[PDB]
């Protein structure tokens, strides 16, 4: 599942 | 039959800086909030970015419909030559897609890119791959550090192919 | 300080430029230095224009004329971007140089820009029928007129500065 970077 | 490129940063440099780059150099970049994905040069969506679970990926925030739907249808530094603009591109990653799968995208879609996180990003000039670089963060200022790079001579030749 | 809390902002009517490009053309440094009036630059006619603010795309648009001015008709608003605004001698001669033909540009407040919608007609400054600005490296270097022969569109140089001044622009 997508973990958001930045 | 279609390639989705995700640019991480565009770095405007002069030819002389290009030819003087060496491994270990860190190139300052703007913290990329958004990421615009392109297809043969043309923006088709904006998106946030991250991983899933070990691959880099985009979380689509906005599709640029009209474009998507139309896809469906040895020389001193004083020298002026040394000051010529060369755009340096850092790609977050790419993915090959069918127009169909592309048009099936919507806000929220998570598109994985063909590269593992933590492995160095591609760096290109004039669309040709000339180096690898890794993202570096120090006190929230971002940068790309050159890990590997072709010779200044090959840079010069790939630029003017 | 414990200040911005109770604070009422003055009207700050600072402006942006919306730029609309007719064509981008890859050329080589030699070709840039040897360009002369009468020369014709082959361009595929654009089915639409992506308008930029400071090099960032903000909208797609159709184009044409209104009040004898070049103009855009807003096709599509790239909303997040808009909302965020609101918040070896022969190698050398082969060096690529992007030459840009510019349909026109206008100054807008962010308020004006955020009010645009599918439909909005935006007039560009500079009159229709007068020649188009030609730039390299973001500097004016030439003027051009859109031409046709068969289904072949081109931009023919009407005016252009000296090669010395072109070389200079390029490196500025």
Author numbering:
A (entry chain C): 128 to 133
B (entry chain A): 18 to 90, 140 to 227
C (entry chain B): 4 to 90, 143 to 227
Recite the paper's sentences.
Type III secretion systems (T3SS) allow the transport of protein substrates directly across the double membrane of Gram-negative bacteria. Proteomic analyses have identified the major components of the sorting platform for the Salmonella typhimurium SPI-1 injectisome: the AAA+ ATPase InvC, its regulator OrgB and the proteins SpaO and OrgA4. Here we show that a novel, heterotypic interaction between SPOA domains serves as a scaffold for sorting platform assembly in both injectisome and flagellar T3SS. Our structures suggest a partial model for the subtype-specific assembly of the T3SS sorting platforms: the heterotypic interaction between SPOA domains within a given T3SS subtype functions as an adaptor for ATPase and its regulator through interaction with the APAR peptide.
